[PDB]
Amino acid sequence: LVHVASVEKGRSYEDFQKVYNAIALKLREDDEYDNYIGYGPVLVRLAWHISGTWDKHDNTGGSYGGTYRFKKEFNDPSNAGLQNGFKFLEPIHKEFPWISSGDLFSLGGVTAVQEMQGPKIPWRCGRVDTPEDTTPDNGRLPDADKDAGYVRTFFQRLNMNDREVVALMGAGALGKTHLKNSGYEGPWGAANNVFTNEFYLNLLNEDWKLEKNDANNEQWDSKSGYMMLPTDYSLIQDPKYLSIVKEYANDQDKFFKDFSKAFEKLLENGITFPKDAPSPFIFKTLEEQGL
Numbered sequence: 263l264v265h266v267a268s269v270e271k272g273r274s275y276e277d278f279q280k281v282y283n284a285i286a287l288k289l290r291e292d293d294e295y296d297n298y299i300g301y302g303p304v305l306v307r308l309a310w311h312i313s314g315t316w317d318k319h320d321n322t323g324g325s326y327g328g329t330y331r332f333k334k335e336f337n338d339p340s341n342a343g344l345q346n347g348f349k350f351l352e353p354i355h356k357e358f359p360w361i362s363s364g365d366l367f368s369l370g371g372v373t374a375v376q377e378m379q380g381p382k383i384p385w386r387c388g389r390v391d392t393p394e395d396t397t398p399d400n401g402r403l404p405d406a407d408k409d410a411g412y413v414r415t416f417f418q419r420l421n422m423n424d425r426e427v428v429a430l431m432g433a434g435a436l437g438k439t440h441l442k443n444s445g446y447e448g449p450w451g452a453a454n455n456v457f458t459n460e461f462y463l464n465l466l467n468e469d470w471k472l473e474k475n476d477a478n479n480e481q482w483d484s485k486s487g488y489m490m491l492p493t494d495y496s497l498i499q500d501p502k503y504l505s506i507v508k509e510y511a512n513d514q515d516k517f518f519k520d521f522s523k524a525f526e527k528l529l530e531n532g533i534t535f536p537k538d539a540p541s542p543f544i545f546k547t548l549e550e551q552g553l
């Protein structure tokens with residue numbers, strides 16, 4: 263199964279930077295969503311979920327085809343809550359109808375991370391919408407009530423290694439869990455709309471207690487008011503994971519670099535880029551533009 267990247271006709275960096283800006287501007291302006299956390303976290307979660315369906319074995323799923331727009335994937339119970347990010351983007355798509363769904367869902371994720379003060383994520387255009395019959399079946403996204411062995415094995419299907427998995431989960435510590443969405447409730451940290459390495463620090467320094475939530479699911483709770491999923495907490499139970507958690511807790515910059523590499527890889531999995539494709543774009547932030 264091959265998916266060759268095809269740049270939207272005649273567009274270049276400036277076209278995409280325009281789309282970035284529009285996304286960043288609306289992020290700034292629609293600030294009250296989810297008790298003033300804003301739409302940043304739900305957007306990087308959308309980018310991860312549309313990419314996280316990939317299967318390295320037959321090159322199905324992945325961000326290329328933008329199949330999240332089809333009802334099968336849109337109604338995947340694992341995607342509960344993501345409709346709010348879709349609806350955020352919808353007006354922008356209307357304004358820039360030439361961009362493909364896959365490119366818009368993934369750039370939404372790049373934009374959010376950069377605007378939340380995370381690292382720069384190089385990004386490549388060229389994703390092409392594929393038909394409804396190419397929509398992956400529900401069930402390729404990971405469960406939260408499992409252990410380290412599960413996490414390691416799961417991510418192998420996405421060609422991610424231990425260091426990649428740990429950088430990816432740490433993910434700036436953004437947004438929160440919502441009981442009506444996932445059966446889990448609460449945030450990972452105090453800065454839920456600033457990209458930081460706090461997840462690792464919190465993991466290692468908080469006093470966690472294993473409790474049952476109102477959805478009758480177990481989660482790890484801290485006196486600070488934070489929570490960890492069993493899959494999150496398993497990162498300090500596994501000896502390989504734990505050393506990497508400790509390294510990112512002690513080195514912000516290393517974490518930033520490592521995440522940037524892994525997120526881009528995640529967003530590009532399954533995509534073939536022709537030798538003559540343009541180099542990756544690095545978008546400037548509103549801040550760097552004085553906007």
Ligand code: HEM
Nearest residue numbers: 303304307310343404405406430433437438439440443444
């Ligand atoms: C073993 C892997 C992971 C599991 C099982 C998982 C599970 C969870 C679940 C249960 C939530 C709560 C959703 C809600 O109630 O609204 C959540 C939210 C979130 N996850 Fe993950 N996830 C994992 C990996 C990732 C990774 C790789 C990223 C992205 C780089 C990511 C980004 C997010 C973010 C930003 C949200 C917050 C969304 C918001 O605030 O609405 N997750 N995750």
